[PDB]
Ligand binder design. Sequence first.
Ligand SMILES: *[C@@H]1O[C@H](CO)[C@@H](O)[C@H](O)[C@H]1NC(C)=O
Lengths: 97, 206, 138
Amino acid sequence: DVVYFPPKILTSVGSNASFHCIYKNENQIISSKQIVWWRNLAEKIPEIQYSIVSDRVSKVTFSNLKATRPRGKFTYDAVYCCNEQACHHRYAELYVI
Amino acid sequence: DVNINISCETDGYLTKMTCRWSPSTIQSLVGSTVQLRYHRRSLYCPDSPSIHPTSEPKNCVLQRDGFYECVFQPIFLLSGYTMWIRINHSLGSLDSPPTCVLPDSVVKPLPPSNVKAEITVNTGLLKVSWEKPVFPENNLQFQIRYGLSGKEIQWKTHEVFDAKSKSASLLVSDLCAVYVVQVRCRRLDGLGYWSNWSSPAYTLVM
Amino acid sequence: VPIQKVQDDTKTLIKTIVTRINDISHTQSVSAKQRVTGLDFIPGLHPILSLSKMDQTLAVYQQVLTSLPSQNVLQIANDLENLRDLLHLLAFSKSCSLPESLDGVLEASLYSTEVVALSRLQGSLQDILQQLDVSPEC
Ligand SMILES: *[C@@H]1O[C@H](CO)[C@@H](O)[C@H](O)[C@H]1NC(C)=O
């Protein structure tokens, strides 16, 4: 299971938004250095934007947010907390208007 | 006169099929309902359609032209749709002769896109080029109409039967005139309608 | 019924579904090889070799796509149903016969379910199409 802090973010263009995540891999929390972030399972977010809040909580910071381009019915971007190559099904909903 | 003809047309995206029929012979007979019934066969149409005992009603909407339109969405591209008109009168019911339509065979493709027209002055030929629509995947035939841009276009048509042809060269009488070109397509086997004419393409001259 | 025509219509239908999935922009960018945990019930890279394996794979993809609330997936599910019927018609040729965590992943992660389902479906269909040139065993 994964936990996002916060589960959802609603913001406007140009603002900054940060997501925290906890990755409990098969009953053991992996090191925050092992956690990587993905965007809509399509492209890895540059490691420059990552921030190690603590040994277990990873943080991603978005600067000068661009308006989220809708992909059909999906008007939000799915942010994924992943344990290296292996991602999880649960994602964070990022709304940029 | 229960000889009502039902015509169906599948959109260029193969997402829905609209069927049209006229109740012009039944409007006088009031006090009874008229609705479209249909039955779907897993694959293809039988050689001789038959009124299957088990059918389902389809909701049709009356249009301003007086015809009823029934839209099937989603569709089963390779399923045979047997449909007919049922009149449920107080004395009983009457059924029109059933017809079976295969949605794959009544597809109206989208017009060819990325239509380009260029005049090669080195040879004096009008070169037309286009890109086939996304659908259908079957081999297509193309027809090109071209003429001098003006008040009343005097159209000329050229038929292209090469399925793998992506261009056509036409010898025009006036090399210094601006021509307008539009292209439409249809299934090579003729099992379907002609597409609409593409967005007009214009040549240059200098 | 001409079996050659059934095979040609099967190839045309497979190409149609592949093109439809290609038209959904947000699906082509997702790597079908990159594994996602929690969605192991969605036939990833199973070496599809028999007709019954193709049928069960397409039935799984059909059941998954049926739950999604989009009309594109509903249409793809209907096309897959037609493809399955075509596969049964092709099976009757060579004289041979053929025989719940989804709710939680749909409720919590609809986007992941749709994306992974469509990417795996595209990969499976490209494998079936590429293997249709070689006579497949029952
Ligand atoms: C948002 O991030 C940018 C990135 O450099 C920074 O300059 C700006 O000060 C941040 N805004 C706030 C309110 O923190």
